[PDB]
Amino acid sequence: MNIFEMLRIDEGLRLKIYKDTEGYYTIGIGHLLTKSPSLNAAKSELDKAIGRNTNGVITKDEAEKLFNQDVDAAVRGILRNAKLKPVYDSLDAVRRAALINMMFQMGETGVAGFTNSLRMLQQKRWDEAAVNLAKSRWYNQTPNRAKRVITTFRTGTWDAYK
């Protein structure tokens, strides 16, 4: 197991524009297009991303390509952040993947608000962090996924993905 397989499981794969759990236009493997309620705006963003007139539909290869870029950007987003980097650096390889998944799902900003849980993760207080992470809109809104990530932080293994 790895980051890619992990998120592929969490986000699925769709080749046609769709609305995510928050109702935003997305495509591929959790690739957010826009927070705009406009579909045309979504189509436009999609075409811009792909480099062609897609008409709201892409190929598997294209999805994969967005996905690789998005994973890469997430990691970089972490590394570029002064508050995130240190956390990320203190962790083992499995736990890091947990951190990248949250980052992918929620962006720098969302991740930002877990300051307290982050401190705990940094101190290696596993069970406490798991408890703190659970006290969040994030857990209340996407419980099954949240549970998978949380277990991952808690145990340092991939058991929730097996």
Residues tagged active-site: 11, 20
* Window contacting Cl ion (CB under 5 A); options: 47-55, 72-80, 101-109, 118-126: 47-55
The amino acid at residue 86 is: P
Residue 145, interface with Cl ion (CB under 5 A)? yes
Q: Is 67 annotated as a binding residue?
A: no
Residue 101, interface with Cl ion (CB under 5 A)? no
Sheet of 31-34, strand order: 14-19, 25-28, 31-34
Residue 137, interface with Cl ion (CB under 5 A)? no
Q: How far is the CB of 84 from Cl ion (least distance, A)?
A: 21
- 37 neighbors 30 (Cβ within 8 angstroms): no
108-124 per-residue burial string, b: 16 or more CB within 10 A, e: under 16: eeebeebeebbebbeee
Q: Is 101 annotated as a binding residue?
A: no
Residue 109 vs 144, nearer CB to Cl ion: 144
Q: How far is the CB of 145 from Cl ion (least distance, A)?
A: 4
Question: Which parts of this chain interact with Cl ion (CB under 5 A)?
Answer: 49, 142, 144-145
